[PDB]
RNA sequence: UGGAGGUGAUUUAAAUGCCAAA
RNA sequence: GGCGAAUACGUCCCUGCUCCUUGCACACACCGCCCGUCACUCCACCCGAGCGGGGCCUAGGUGAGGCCCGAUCUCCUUCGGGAGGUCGGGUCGAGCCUAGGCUCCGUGAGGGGGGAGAAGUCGUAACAAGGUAGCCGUAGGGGAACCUACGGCUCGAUCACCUCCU
RNA sequence: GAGUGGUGGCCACUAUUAUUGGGCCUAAAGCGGCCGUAGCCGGGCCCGUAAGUCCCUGGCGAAAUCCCACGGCUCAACCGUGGGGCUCGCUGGGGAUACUGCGGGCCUUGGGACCGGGAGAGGCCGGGGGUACCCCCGGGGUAGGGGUGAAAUCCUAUAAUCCCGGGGGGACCGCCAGUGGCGAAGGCGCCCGGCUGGAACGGGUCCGACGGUGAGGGCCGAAGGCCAGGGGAGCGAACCGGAUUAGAUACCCGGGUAGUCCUGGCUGUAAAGGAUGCGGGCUAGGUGUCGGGCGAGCUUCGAGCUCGCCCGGUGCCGUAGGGAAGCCGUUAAGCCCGCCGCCUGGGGAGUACGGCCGCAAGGCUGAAACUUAAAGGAAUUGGCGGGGGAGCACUACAAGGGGUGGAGCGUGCGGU
RNA sequence: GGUGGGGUAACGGCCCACCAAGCCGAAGAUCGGUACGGGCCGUGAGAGCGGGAGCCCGGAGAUGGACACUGAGACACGGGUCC
């Protein structure tokens, strides 16, 4: 992914690391359904 | 700065501004040419001949005498050697770089994991290619001449 | 960052290329050249439109304001799309009946969009059955056909 | 006087903000 | 008014208040601020079985009509020929049919996150050393914010010691 | 003011598209690092040419439209006669040579080559070691050891913890050690030997502009992960138990698989940060430290010590100047000459669709509908902290004396 | 692109027969999108940015797609033929 160091600031949002993990989990499911 | 390392060394020679040879110098032009030919026949490099002439015979650079045959230019060691047919076929710095590259390649055959030394080889070959382009432009090398390490 | 480049006398092509390249980062230029507004505009570039009323609704104001704003759903004659139009005035909703025809135009907010404390509404009613709504609100005129 | 680094440690548990301001 | 003691001559441990210094995403001033899942309402969008309808390329077949060259026929000739019908040959050709491949529009069972709203719910992850310092990369685990391991940064508080400077 | 308001579009506002004329340490923005092809930018002198460039002059670029004076409709708008401009573009000739281009000649300052005495955890290969830790065997001794805020799981009469004599194994190199050294960056620390890369200083040595940057392209690249074959001491994702808690999928405790280590490949990612791209010239001083050279003085004569100056690295304080400020300040974030990369309010979103690469995990490239009035930075005054320091109080404690909370009743309050 | 012809008012791969492997392209070919071109017009201190219906000059069309007769000139808006 591309870097947005502004997203790492914690004021008014959750941690960027776990958002990235959640997005990567979401993208796996779409890829699996595409192969079917 | 340096071509690759980007350092700023300043060491070098500081030649005073002068035109005529000094009074205390007693050698004539012919003696100097004979000395140069003798030293070349002993097997020295062009840069080494001038060093010996300066250190031992008390002769500052031979670029203080006009060329007796061509009055429009001054004398240099390479021109003196050309006047007798002892000049190198390949320019000396190119030959030295090629010689350094050949020795390093056979080291890297027994040490394939020496990655830091390999970058030195790449830089050396970059210098070689710059020089060969320049010498092709001026006509000092044949147009078909090519550098191949496998040779 | 060094000096701005290129500055050479014979470097016109690169300079023109650079200026063209970075002009696409301007959002106003991009929307005009690619014609993005015309692709999604329900009014199809017109300043006004005519439609038929389907039903009456009310929308709550945003915080920290309080109140209900009276609006209508309008189906456009020219393409059949359905939009929402605000009815300006005090008690103006009483002059609107279902199945009437109305003329609507932009509401006049920033960037050609919504305004005030009612986002989501982009249009307002101007005429009802070919009679000015402002007159009806003030008086001076009666709504035709009862 | 004022600064910049390094190594150590740092004794239980302790969540929340309604009413009102309107 | 009568009668008339015990203990301490201290400390900031508990409850609090004053001043110096330091951190702060707080100023309604920590009774502050603030995050995510599940439930409810509305809006735009994505994937998508099926279902219809259009447009382009190809390949094959067919082909109104046009032109040219032959043979023959009918009627007029100022005898030079002209006007046309029928058959044969060659060539060009709009359109039409079949098959294949790309592409557009309308519906669409089912699935997915996004944005507003205001509170139905469970917790308290971030801001002070936020009560386990916070954050980046990679990997595993968990109702949900999150937790753990290896390498990194200071955009980390307090005490003791050490080191290097002005 | 016979007009005056609403809606949509273009220019200006806007130096929010910047040639004139913007930005990129902390606010959006310098590729993780380097090598190099095209392009762009390129040191000094002499001779020639005349393509670029400048001057003069012929042939052209319709009219209408624009500007000026005069003239006709009452003046004007409008129209006519003259003078300019516009279509900035083309073409035939003549003249000049400062700059750029092209051809020839001559240089040494930038860059490269070579020689000398030295410096350094730069890299690869072989050998030899240092304590420490774990397991096994033998001797002594006997009831606990371990661990926490407090405990428990766990180990121990098959003799543990602790002490002594032996055998085996895998990883790692303490103090000295230093805003010290080396490397393009990632990174590099036991000792002896071999091979090898780069840099600084000293230089009347050699070549003679051979240079800077670099779209496409190439090579290197912490940890983790994957594919085959080994190894496995200690530590330790997942997992299994003991606790804490309202719950505790955690923090704390006892165990433990992958992994961490070696050989051959793949992946190409970090707060890969000096959050600061690289080359050149110039613009006060002061003071430490590392390498080389020079001078002077000491000396146990040491590759030793002290002081001064030059060059190159590495820190601190600071003048002019710069900046929103924090601050930077010859190691610039100052003034000037170059080249490439990137940014254009906050979200949606580094997402959807398409393409390339990879065994996989994943990498590079990258929108729109819609939504929103701020998001973001530096600094100020207060209030607060399960931050530090100093002080104080029987509506605080500590040392004491007497009580209230249980019963009946007096009186006040909520509720009914 | 060459050689030899045909056809045209006329030069030409405009069209044929034969001989070669050429031509264009990261200084953007090919393909896709959107548009008649210019003199001019709107705005701005200028450098620029945006438009090009109405008047003049040039191009193209006559419901869509093809094709001919007459003539100096047409494949003809108020002439002809087919789908
Ligand atoms: Mg506030
Ligand atoms: Mg709270
Ligand atoms: Mg917390
Ligand atoms: Mg915490
Ligand atoms: Mg876990
Ligand atoms: Mg504006
Ligand atoms: Mg700006
Ligand atoms: Mg930023
Ligand atoms: Mg960088
Ligand atoms: Mg960076
Ligand atoms: Mg020059
Ligand atoms: Mg000229
Ligand atoms: Mg004119
Ligand atoms: Mg008059
Ligand atoms: Mg007049
Ligand atoms: Mg006139
Ligand atoms: Mg024993
Ligand atoms: Mg380069
Ligand atoms: Mg680092
Ligand atoms: Mg220095
Ligand atoms: Mg300073
Ligand atoms: Mg894809
Ligand atoms: Mg009390
Ligand atoms: Mg007490
Ligand atoms: Mg009582
Ligand atoms: Mg146009
Ligand atoms: Mg008209």
C62 Cβ within 7 A of any nucleic strand E atom: yes
Around C90, how many Cα atoms within 13 Å sit in the side-chain half-sphere? 2
Give the closest nucleotide to B97 (alpha carbon vs C1'). F113
CB-based contacts of A19: which residues, under 8 Å, 6+ apart? A7
DSSP three-state, residue B69 = coil
Q: How much is the CA Rg of chain A, to the nearest whole Å?
A: 13
Q: Rounded to 5 degrees, what are φ and ψ at B128? A: -60, -45
Helix H or strand E segment including C135: helix C133-138
Q: CB of C104 within 8 A of CB of C49?
A: yes
B77-111 burial, b at 16+ Cβ within 10 Å, e below that, comes to: bebbbebeeebeeebeebeebbeebeeeeeeeeee
8 A C-beta contact, residue B37 and residue B84: yes
Q: Taking a C-beta distance cutoff of 8 angstroms, is the pair C81, C132 a contact?
A: no
Separation between Cα atoms, residue B59 and residue B33, nearest integer Å: 12
State which residues form the domain around C128.
Answer: 1-146
- Give Cβ neighbours of residue B36 (< 8 Å, ≥ 6 apart): B49, B53, B62, B77, B80, B81
Cβ(B91)–Cβ(B82) below 8 Å: no
Q: Which tokens is B18 given? A: 């002068």
d(CA B6, CA B80): 37
Task: Extract long-range pairs of B107-116: CB within 8 Å, 24+ residues apart.
Answer: none
DSSP C8-64: -TT-HHHHHHHHHHHHTT-HHHHHHHHTHHHHH-TTTT-SEEEEEEEEEEEEEPPTT
Burial class (CB in 10 A: 0-12, 13-18, 19+), C86: buried
Q: Are C78 and C44 in contact (CB under 8 A)?
A: yes
For this PDB entry, the determination method is cryo-EM
Contacts of residue C51, defined as CB under 8 A and 6 or more positions apart, other chains included, come to C74, C75, C76, C77, C83, C85, C101, C102, C104
How many angstroms separate the alpha carbon of residue B35 from the centre of ligand 24?
113
Domain count, chain C: 1
| Gap from CA of B63 to ligand 23 centroid (Å) | 106
Cβ burial, residue C100 (10 Å; 0-12/13-18/19+): middle
CA torsion, points C116, C122, C127, C130, in degrees to nearest 10?
Answer: 180
| B62, B32 contact by CB (below 8 A) | yes
Q: Which residues have a Cβ under 8 Å from the Cβ of C78 and sit 6 or more positions away?
A: C44, C49, C50
Question: Is the Cα dihedral B110, B116, B122, B128 positive or negative?
Answer: negative
The Cα–Cα gap between C127 and C101 comes to: 8
Question: What resolution in Å is listed for this PDB structure?
Answer: 2.6
Beta strands in B48-109 (DSSP E): none
Distance C95 CA to F92 C1' (A): 83
In DSSP terms, C71 is beta-bridged to C57, C86
Under 8 Å between Cβ of C51 and C43:
no
Angle among Cα B10, B12, B16 to the nearest 5 degrees reads 120
Q: Which of C125, C55, C122 is nearest to C92 (CA)?
A: C125
Residue in B57, B42, B131 with CA at minimum distance from that of residue B94:
B131
Give the CA distances from residue C61 to residues C106, C121, C123, in Å, rounded to whole numbers and listed in that order. Answer: 19, 11, 16
Q: Which nucleotide C1' is nearest A13 CA?
A: E35
């Amino acid at each position: 992914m591309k870097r947005r160091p502004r997203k790492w600031k914690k004021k008014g949002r959750m941690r960027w690391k776990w958002i990235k993990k959640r997005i990567r989990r979401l993208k796996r499911q779409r890829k699996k359904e595409r192969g079917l | 700065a340096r071509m690759h390392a980007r350092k700023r060394g300043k060491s070098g020679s500081k030649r005073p501004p002068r035109t005529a040879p000094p009074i205390w110098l007693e050698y004539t032009v012919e003696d100097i040419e004979n000395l140069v030919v003798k030293l070349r026949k002993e097997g020295y490099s062009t840069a080494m001949i001038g060093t010996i002439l300066r250190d031992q015979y008390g002769i500052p650079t031979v670029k203080l005498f006009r060329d007796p045959d061509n009055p429009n230019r001054k004398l240099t060691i390479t021109r003196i050697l050309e006047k007798h047919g002892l000049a190198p076929e390949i320019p000396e710095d190119l030959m030295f770089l090629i010689k350094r590259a050949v020795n390093l390649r056979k080291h890297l055959e027994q040490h394939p994991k020496d990655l830091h030394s390999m970058r030195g080889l790449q830089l050396i070959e970059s210098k070689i290619r710059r020089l060969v382009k320049y010498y092709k432009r001026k006509g000092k090398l044949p147009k078909d001449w090519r550098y191949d390490p496998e040779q | 960052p060094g000096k701005k480049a290129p500055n050479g006398e014979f470097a016109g092509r690169k300079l023109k290329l650079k200026r063209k390249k970075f002009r696409w980062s301007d959002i106003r230029y991009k929307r005009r050249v690619l014609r993005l507004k015309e692709k999604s505009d329900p009014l199809e570039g017109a300043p006004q439109a005519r439609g038929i009323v389907l039903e009456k609704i009310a929308v709550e104001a945003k915080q920290p304001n309080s109140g209900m704003r009276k609006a209508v759903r309008v189906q456009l004659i020219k393409n059949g799309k359905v939009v929402t139009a605000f009815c300006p005035g005090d008690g103006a909703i009483k002059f609107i009946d279902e199945h009437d025809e109305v003329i609507i135009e932009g509401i006049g907010g920033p960037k050609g969009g919504s305004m005030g404390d009612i986002p989501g509404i982009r249009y307002k009613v101007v005429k009802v059955n070919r009679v000015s709504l402002k007159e009806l609100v003030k008086g001076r005129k009666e709504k035709p056909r009862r």
